[PDB]
Design a protein around this ligand. Sequence first.
Ligand SMILES: *[C@@H]1O[C@H](CO)[C@@H](O)[C@H](O)[C@H]1NC(C)=O
Length: 313
Amino acid sequence: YLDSQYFGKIYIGTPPQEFTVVFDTGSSDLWVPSIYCKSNVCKNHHRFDPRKSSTFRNLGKPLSIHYGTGSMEGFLGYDTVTVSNIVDPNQTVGLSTEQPGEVFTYSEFDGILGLAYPSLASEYSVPVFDNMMDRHLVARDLFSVYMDRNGQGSMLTLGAIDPSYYTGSLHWVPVTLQQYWQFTVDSVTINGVAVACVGGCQAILDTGTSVLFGPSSDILKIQMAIGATENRYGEFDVNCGNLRSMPTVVFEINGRDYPLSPSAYTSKDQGFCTSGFQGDNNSELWILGDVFIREYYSVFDRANNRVGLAKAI
Ligand SMILES: *[C@@H]1O[C@H](CO)[C@@H](O)[C@H](O)[C@H]1NC(C)=O
């Protein structure tokens, strides 16, 4: 759930040391590799050296996070972190000392900056946006996410909504459980009939994920409804020539329709077209990743515990 290209540069310490991080609405901790991680993966990424920062303070607290295909262990420090033109002082930063796992081998980011609720933060870790809200460094207690449909995009706006990135009106959906950015999806219909999320379901908006995940049974119904066929890689593909005649998949959220066109829910790479839906056999949680967010400019409002959606430019 960390394969999206929703990265950004951040700066930590005095003078600033630069890192690339995935901005992840599916988690809540900030961490980057430290100079004390000596593995190949770490040595060939940016590593924070606390000895070189005059504002660094060691918290005397550990951090350990497990991922599907890896884990990180490290230590926590305070330092100044700059993100999207906001300078965030006295910010807890996780600093890796080990990073086993394929996830880090195959990911271009140095670290992760979580944007979910503090309930998901590790012990002793304070989420970046929480620290910013607490210190009153943002104009409003919300942030906004634009992902450009074509090629690694594009913007994280902290403390504001940027109307230049959407058309039509912003519509709001209440958060149901304040951990992930979680809410109710009412239905998923295709060709005007119920296919998935029948009777409603729980979903999250997850900027860290490239695809759209759902329970396997429901997802298989979607693959069949869109005319996709399973291949030997375990993915589902379609004839690119059929995109013009394929159906829209409609996510209904708080009673309004959020259609995904065939071009939006498939990937086309040198004439090979694959479904952006992926099934999970061990979870009923729908994960609306970049497939969805590329189509819908997304506002994450902590003051009012709600998500705002509008059609992206
Ligand atoms: C903020 O950080 C400074 C050092 O940078 C420290 O002296 C101070 O105690 C911190 N403030 C709080 C409220 O933790």
